């Protein structure tokens, strides 16, 4: 349930990558063509038309653009996660083989050692341990 | 009336729901009145279906399950799940028993042949895997696929091992011997689904167009039909508009019931080589179907989170 929150997670973390990189792409094609835009209407120079037309296209570059930083932050912020989340991912394998090591010494410290001492019960751990 | 009519009705007998994910795959019990279903969010959900009551929640796989495969004892369950892991439950118990690694993809599938020693397993990594069941060690492998191996079943005999792949091929191998009996190449688009023919439909094939035959279902819409010890396309069933998601004999041998993604349950005889019932089953893509051997009774699995269950008449 540990890993079941993990796997999750991590699959969102790329697609909000993805999410990102669907947008950086768009935002350079709208870019290039707001200014193929802007050359056009110097060529004119419907020219009121066009004013408006590449208004409506900077405001939605903007509307982008603030998409994209906001979530630039969400993808600077989230990663932090990222870096010890799939570390966490790998490490997995390595505490699933050791469950019956540790559940062994558990067991044992809590089902027998309970009337002895401090120096007594350090000892029984160690020789099973 | 006989099992050998048998075609659901709408509306559905019932409507199980409490799933959190898309349904992939759907099977019944082989002598008990359960029916166990997989689903995205890797509960393993066990139902009745006679009353629509829920049973139990399985949870071992830490990542979405695909297939799950009984025994036919019904004491053995074979889960794959996209965490690299396959397991292997106990039913009477309703506790894991081992968990099996060595896949470095998404096990796409899972099977126990009818000897009741081993399991296939087919991922996306291009190879299909032999497991030994109770020693817990992968044996063999199937090699040569070079696509996404999308769902494996053996033979009812348990000698004829058949896999569909991404690569508009279906395989079928012998068991050990490990070559590719018949690598039929005539579908257009990804397979994604066969069904192993029974016994009875062994004549109802073969006056249609001996044995073995096998079912086929791709994304191209339509469902071919294969006769293995010659190996090419004997008939095929266009009338699907999406992709065939999954394709299924009837338990008697002359229907076949088939789910396709343009919300279609439809039925089909090869006789007529038509559809002559489609059923509006969910309200989104339709992933899995089964029909009952003994029992009247068609249930599907699909991404509407919803499971429903239709009697046959």
């Excluded at chain 1, 973390?13 to 870019?31: A, G, Y």
């Excluded at chain 1, 009121?48 to 296209?57: D, F, M, N």
């Amino acid at each position: 349930e540990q890993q079941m929150h993990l796997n999750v997670g991590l699959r969102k973390i790329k697609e909000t990558v993805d999410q990102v990189e669907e947008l950086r792409r768009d935002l350079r094609i709208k870019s290039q063509e707001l200014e193929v835009k802007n050359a056009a209407a110097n060529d004119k120079l419907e020219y009121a038309v066009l004013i408006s037309e590449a208004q409506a296209i900077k405001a939605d570059l903007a509307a982008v653009e603030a998409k994209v930083n906001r979530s630039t932050a969400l993808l600077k912020s989230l990663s932090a996660e990222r870096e010890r989340w799939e570390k966490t991912s790998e490490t997995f394998k390595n505490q699933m083989s050791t469950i019956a090591g540790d559940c062994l010494l558990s067991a044992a410290f809590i089902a027998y050692a309970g009337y002895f001492d401090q120096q007594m019960r350090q000892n029984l751990f160690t020789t099973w341990s | 009336r006989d099992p050998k009519e048998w075609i659901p009705r709408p509306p559905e007998k019932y409507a199980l729901s409490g799933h959190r994910s898309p349904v992939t795959r759907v099977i019944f019990h082989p002598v008990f009145s359960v029916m166990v279903s997989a689903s995205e969010d890797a509960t393993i959900k066990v139902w009745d279906y006679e009353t629509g009551d829920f049973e139990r929640t399985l949870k071992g796989h830490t990542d979405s399950v695909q297939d799950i495969s009984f025994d036919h004892s019904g004491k053995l369950l074979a889960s794959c799940s996209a965490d690299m892991t396959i397991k292997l439950w106990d039913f009477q118990g309703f506790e894991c028993i081992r968990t099996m690694h060595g896949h470095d993809h998404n096990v796409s599938s899972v099977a126990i042949m009818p000897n009741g020693d081993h399991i296939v397993s087919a991922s996306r990594d291009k190879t299909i895997k032999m497991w030994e069941v109770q020693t817990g060690y992968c044996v063999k492998t199937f090699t040569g696929h070079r696509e996404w191996v999308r769902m494996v079943r053996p033979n009812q005999d348990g000698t004829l091992i058949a896999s569909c792949s991404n690569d508009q091929t279906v395989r079928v191998w012998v068991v050990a011997t490990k070559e590719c009996k018949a690598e039929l190449r005539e579908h257009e688009h990804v397979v994604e689904c066969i069904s192993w023919a029974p016994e009875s439909s062994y004549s109802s094939i073969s006056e249609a167009t001996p044995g073995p035959f096998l079912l086929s279902g791709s994304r191209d819409k339509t469902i071919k039909m294969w006769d293995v010890s010659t190996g090419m396309c004997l008939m095929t069933l266009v009338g699907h508009d999406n992709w065939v998601r999954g394709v299924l004999f009837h338990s008697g041998g002359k229907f076949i019931l088939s789910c396709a993604d343009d919300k279609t349950l439809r039925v089909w005889d090869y006789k007529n080589k038509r559809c002559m019932k489609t059923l509006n089953a969910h309200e989104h893509f339709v992933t899995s179907l089964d029909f009952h051997k003994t029992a009247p009774y068609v249930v599907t699995g699909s991404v509407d989170q919803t499971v429903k269950v239709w009697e046959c008449r």
